[PDB]
Design a protein around this ligand. Structure first.
Ligand SMILES: OC[C@H]1O[C@@H](O)[C@H](O)[C@@H](O)[C@@H]1O
Ligand SMILES: OC[C@H]1O[C@@H](O)[C@H](O)[C@@H](O)[C@@H]1O
Ligand SMILES: OC[C@H]1O[C@@H](O)[C@H](O)[C@@H](O)[C@@H]1O
Lengths: 448, 447, 448
C-alpha cells in the first residue's frame, strides 16, 4: 500500500490572527468584537483572553524558522481586519499593514506559500456598532477591506480565502451566543448567515476587478450519520445536516436554502431577494474544507433549534474537545464535497487536527503526543483514499502550527503540532510535528 | 478637562550623590563618583558632590519644602556606600540611621517614600572587584537590597531596583563620560547583562524577605524617522535597539534585540539560558524616566550605533540640548503600555527640564516661564496618555532641588526649587508654585 | 477609427547596459568585450566609447523620475554580466548586484514594471578569453549567471529576456566584425549562432528549476520584400530572409535550421547533434520582437555571404541610420511572427523607434523632433492594426528612453525620446517623449 501524494500537492499548517498574535490593540490596531467579548466575565474559560496568546506579533520570525524546520510548503493564516483598518472603514493603519507585509515577505523568502484568509471571526467593533453581520452594507464593507489587501499583496499572495467557517460565525456568534458578538437569536442567525454569504460574493467580485490569483470560501463540514432506523431520528439527522452542512454550501452551489431550514428556524426564517442568490453564487476558483469529526444525531425535541442531539460513540477515541476520532468520515466527506461541487472545483483541506492534553512545559526538550500522531497519520491516509476515489484535492493544512487560544475554551485546548509554553512563550516541536515533517519530506511515503 | 484619576500620586525626585554631600561622613564609604569627580577633566568646572545641596544636614528643611509643595510622594535613592561602606560586610549604623530618620520624617508629613536602591553610586570597593563586570554583583546587590527591605519593611512600600541601566552602561562603560569612566563595547555588553541580572536577584530577594511592590526604572528616548531613506530607518532601529529595547525586551522575556548583534559586532556575546530566566523575574510596577525624543539618521562613523540625532530646529531646546516635544511623551507611554502588555502599572518616575536661572533669588523669587511651560504641557500629555488607556499611577518631577547634574556639574538646574549653592538658601521657583497648584487642584488648574 | 489598446496592454521604454550606464569597470565591475572593442582605434565612430555614456550608473534615480514624467508602465533594461560576475564565472560582485537591486526596488516603488535582459552584447572578457560564444560551455556559464539573477530578483522581476538579438550578436560580432568581439568568419558565425541558441535553452531550463515568472528570447526581424519578378532575385530574398529572420526562429520553433543556410555558408555550415535542438526548443512563455524597418533584397553575386543586397526605396523617408520608414511592414511582421509561433506564444514589441538629427543641446528647454513623433504615431497605429489581425501582442517598448551610445556608430545616432546633452548629462524630454506620454495616458485614444 503506497501513500505517495500527487505532484504539486501542497503541505502546510494553519493559524488565525486573534488566536496567536496578541498585541490586539497595539500600534494603531483597532478594537475587535473579540477584544470586547474576551474581557467580559463568564464568556471565556478561566478568563483567558487573546491579549498575549502566542505573542506571534513579536515572535513571527522565530515562528517562520519553526515552519522551515517542519518543512512546511505553505502557511495558512488570517489577517486581522481591525489591525489593518481600525474602524473597519476609512483610514488604514500603516503599522498594522506593515506587519503582514513583513510577514508575507518573510514567508516568500523562506520559500513558503502564503495562504491568506480575509475574515477569521474578528470583526472590528466599530462595524459591530453598526449592526455587524446584521447590516447588509457589510457586503460592501468587507469588499472594500478585501480590496485593500488584494492590491497590497498583488502577486505575493496568490491564494485567498474569504470567510472561515460561516457556520461557526453565525451559529456560535448569533444563534447560541457562545462566540463573539455573543447574540442568541434565530431571527438574527438567519440574517447573519445570509449577509455573510453576500459578503463572500461581494469579495469575489471585487477580487475579479482588482485582484490576482485564486479566491474561495472555507467551510467546515461535520457529516451526520444515522443513529437508528427510527424515522424521527432520520428527520433529526436531516435537520442537523441541513442546518450545519448544507446551509451555506447549497446557495453557494445555486440550489437555494435547504427547505428543512423552514422547519428549523420557523417564524425566524425569511425569504430573500432573488438577486442576492446571484451575488452569493459568484463563481470561485477553489474551496477549503475544515474537518475534524462526524456526529451521530438522534431526535431531541427540547434541543433548540435543530431538535437534534449527538449520540456519544463510545467505541472510538474522543479528543479533548469531545470530538470522535473517525478517519473514514473524512474520506466520505471529501467525496461528498467533490460531488456537491460537481468535481469541477479544486479542493484543499484548510484545517484538520486534534486536541489532546499536553503539559504546560516541555519535558526534557520534548512533548510526547502519540494520540495526535495517530490522528495525523490515519487522517492523512484518509486523504490519500479520497484522492484515490477521484477527489481533486490539492493540499492539506494542519490545525494548528501553534498551541493557541481555542476561542471561548481558552488555552486549555491544544491543537498545535508545536507546543507553546504560555508562561515563557518558548516553542517546542511535538512528536506530531516531527512526524508531520517526515510526511512532508517523503511526500507521504513514510506512511507506507 | 484635565482632572487626573482618583489616587493619582504627585511627587518629586532626587538622587543621593546629586544632593546629599557629606560623602565621607559618619562611617560612609567611598563610591566610584567620589573618585570620578575628584579626577581633573571629568567634571565641568571641576564640580564635585562634596557639598551639593547639603541635604544630609538640611533634610528637615527640605521636607518642609515638600510640604509647601503639597507633595504626596518623594522619590529618592539610598547611597549603597553610606549604608555599606565596603559594599559587602559591616553595616554603617549612622548612615542607615540617616535614611531611618528621613523616612520616618516623611511619613510624619504624610509623604510616601519611594526608594531607589541604586542610582549610579557603586561602592568603590566593589569597583575594585570589577564592579558591574563581575557577575557576583548580582548577589552583592541582592544582599544590599535585603538590608533595606528588612529595615524599612512596612514603611517603604514602593521600591525601585536600578535607575536607568542605559545611562549606567552607555555612560559608565561604553563611552566613559560617567563613573567609573570605562570606554569599551565588550565591557558595555557584559555590564548591561549583569545590571539586568542584579535587578532580577534583587526582586527575588524582595519576594523572600520584602514587603510591597518592586520594579525597575527605565529611561526611554523614542526614535522618530529622519527621512524615508532605508539606511536612515536602519539607523533609527539601531539607535532604538541600543537605547530603548536593550533592557526592556529581556525584562519582558523576549531576549536581546537582534540589532545588537550588528551594533556591538565582535563584542557581542551569547549568555546562558538561566540568566534570562533570572532577568525576567516578574515585577509589580515600572518606572519611566522621560525628557525628550530623538530623530536619528545614518552616521557610519558614529561608534557604535552608527547613528546620530538630527537637530529639530522647529522646537525649543533645553539647556541640556534636549528638544521640547510633549506629544512624544504620550506616544512613549502608550508604547510602553503596549510593550508591557498593559498588565504592569506604570509611573513616570522622572520628568523635567533645565533652563538658566540666576545663582541667587531675585527679591525672593525665581521666574522660570519655560520650565513652567514644560511642566504644564507634559502633564497635559500625561492626561492624554491616560485617556488612551495607559495604566499610569503617578508623576514625579525631576527635580525637587537644583542639584549636581553629574559630569555637567551644577550648571544644569533641574529643580522646581532653586538652590543658591553659595548659601544653601532655597527659593521656590514659579514652576514649583505652579506644580503645587497642579497637585492641590488634582489637575483642574490646567483647564 | 478608434485606437484604444487591449486591457493590460503594457507601455514602456527600453535601454541596454553598455549603451547608457558608464562606470563600466567601477565598483568591482569586470572588463567586457566592449571595454576592449571600443578602446581599439578604428572600431568606433569619432572614437566614441561607453566610458561615460548617459552616466546612468550614477543618475538612475533622476532617470526614474523621468520615466514617471513619461507615464511609463514598464522599463526594459539589461544587466551587465561583467558588472555582476567580473570574471563571468565564480565570485559575485556585491556592489554590482546591489546597483540593480536598488534600481529594481526603485522601479517597483514607482509602480514601474522591470523587464530584465540577461545578455545584451556585453560578454565578460574573461569568458571571451575562453572562446566566448565559440565555446559550448558558455551554455552552462550563461545558465549559472542567469540563476544568480533569477534568485536575487525572485518575485520582483517577473518578466525575463534571455538573449537580445542573436542575429546582431553573431552577424555583427563573428561574421563581419563590425561589433565586438570583432571576428570575421563564417565558420565562427555558424558555431556562435548555435551556442547562443543553446545558451538560451540552458537559461530557460535553469529558470524552470529556480526561477519565478515568464521567460523568453528577443529576436530582431527585418522582413524581406520582393525587388522584382526575376527568379534570381527571389532566391536572393530567400537567402537573406533565411540568414536574418529564420536562422534562430525556426530552431526555436522546433523546425530545425533553414535549408538555405547550407547554401549561404557552404563549407562553413555544420551538422550539430540532435539533442542540442531539444535544448534549443525549450518551451518559453513569451517572445520579444525588436523592429525598425524592412528590406528589398536583390541578387548580388559578390556580396558575402548571402549574395544579396538591399534596394534603396527612394519613395519613402529614411532614418539617420539609413533605415526605410514603412509602418505596414511592422504589421506584416507581427502577423508573420504570429503565424510562425502558431498564435500560441504571447508577443511583445521590445524595441521600436527611430534616429533623427537632434542638436547637442536643448533649444529653450525643448527638442523638436517631428519625424520621430511621426514614426511613433504611425508605428503604434500599426501595432493596433496588427492586434486587429489576431496577433497576441501584450506590450510595446520604445527604443530608446535615452539618447545613448549606438554601439559602433557612437553617439551620432540619437534614438531617445529623452534628449541627453553629452557635455553636461542634462536630460530634456523631446516632443516625441511628450507625445508618447500622452499616448500612454489615453491608452491610445490620442491617435483617434
Ligand atoms: O475548534 C478548533 C478550530 O476549529 C476551526 O474550525 C476554527 O477555524 C479554528 O479557529 C478553531 O481553533
Ligand atoms: O539628566 C537629568 C537626569 O536624568 C535622569 O534620568 C537621571 O536619573 C538623573 O541622574 C539626571 O540628573
Ligand atoms: O542597432 C540599433 C539598436 O538595435 C537594437 O535592436 C539593439 O537592441 C540596440 O542596442 C541598438 O541600439
Amino acid at each position: 500500500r503506497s501513500y505517495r501524494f500527487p505532484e504539486g500537492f501542497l503541505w502546510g499548517a494553519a493559524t488565525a490572527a486573534y488566536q496567536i498574535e496578541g498585541s490586539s490593540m497595539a500600534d494603531g490596531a483597532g478594537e475587535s468584537i473579540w477584544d470586547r467579548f474576551s474581557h467580559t466575565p463568564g464568556n471565556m474559560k478561566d478568563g483567558d483572553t487573546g491579549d498575549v496568546a502566542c505573542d506571534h506579533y513579536n515572535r513571527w520570525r522565530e515562528d517562520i524558522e519553526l515552519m522551515k524546520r517542519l518543512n512546511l510548503q505553505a502557511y495558512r493564516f488570517s489577517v486581522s481586519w481591525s489591525r489593518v483598518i481600525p474602524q473597519g472603514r476609512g483610514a488604514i493603519n500603516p503599522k498594522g499593514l506593515a506587519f503582514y507585509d513583513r510577514l508575507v515577505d518573510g514567508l516568500l523568502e523562506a520559500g513558503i506559500e502564503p495562504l491568506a484568509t480575509l475574515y477569521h471571526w474578528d470583526l472590528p467593533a466599530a462595524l459591530d456598532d453598526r449592526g455587524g453581520w446584521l447590516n447588509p452594507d457589510i457586503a460592501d464593507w468587507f469588499a472594500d477591506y478585501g480590496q485593500v489587501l488584494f492590491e497590497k499583496f498583488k502577486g505575493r499572495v496568490k491564494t485567498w480565502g474569504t470567510i472561515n467557517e460561516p457556520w461557526c460565525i453565525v451559529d456560535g456568534g448569533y444563534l447560541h451566543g457562545a462566540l463573539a458578538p455573543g447574540h442568541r437569536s434565530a431571527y438574527e442567525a438567519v440574517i447573519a448567515g445570509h449577509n455573510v454569504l453576500r459578503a463572500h460574493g461581494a469579495a469575489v467580485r471585487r477580487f475579479r476587478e482588482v485582484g490576482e490569483g485564486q479566491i474561495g470560501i472555507v467551510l467546515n463540514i461535520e457529516p451526520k450519520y444515522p443513529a437508528s432506523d427510527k424515522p424521527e431520528d432520520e428527520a433529526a439527522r436531516r435537520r442537523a445536516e441541513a442546518q450545519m452542512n448544507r446551509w451555506f454550501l447549497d446557495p453557494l452551489m445555486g440550489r437555494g436554502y435547504p427547505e428543512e431550514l423552514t422547519d428549523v428556524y420557523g417564524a425566524a426564517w425569511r425569504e430573500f431577494p432573488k438577486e442576492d442568490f446571484e451575488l452569493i453564487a459568484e463563481p470561485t476558483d477553489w474551496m477549503g474544507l475544515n474537518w475534524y469529526t462526524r456526529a451521530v444525531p438522534e431526535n431531541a425535541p427540547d434541543a433548540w433549534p435543530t431538535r437534534s442531539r449527538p449520540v456519544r460513540q463510545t467505541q472510538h477515541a474522543h479528543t479533548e474537545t469531545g470530538w470522535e476520532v473517525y478517519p473514514p468520515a473524512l474520506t466520505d466527506t471529501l467525496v461528498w464535497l467533490s460531488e456537491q461541487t460537481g468535481g469541477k472545483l479544486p479542493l484543499m483541506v484548510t484545517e484538520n487536527g486534534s486536541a489532546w492534553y499536553d503539559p504546560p512545559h516541555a519535558i526534557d526538550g520534548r512533548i510526547h503526543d502519540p494520540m495526535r500522531v495517530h490522528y495525523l497519520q490515519t487522517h492523512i491516509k484518509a486523504l490519500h483514499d479520497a484522492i484515490g476515489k477521484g477527489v481533486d484535492l490539492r493540499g492539506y493544512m494542519v490545525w494548528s502550527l501553534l498551541d493557541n487560544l481555542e476561542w471561548s475554551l481558552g488555552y486549555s485546548k491544544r491543537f498545535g503540532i508545536v507546543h507553546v509554553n504560555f508562561a515563557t512563550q518558548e516553542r517546542t516541536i511535538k512528536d506530531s510535528g516531527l512526524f508531520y515533517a517526515e510526511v512532508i519530506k517523503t511526500h507521504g511515503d513514510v506512511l507506507n
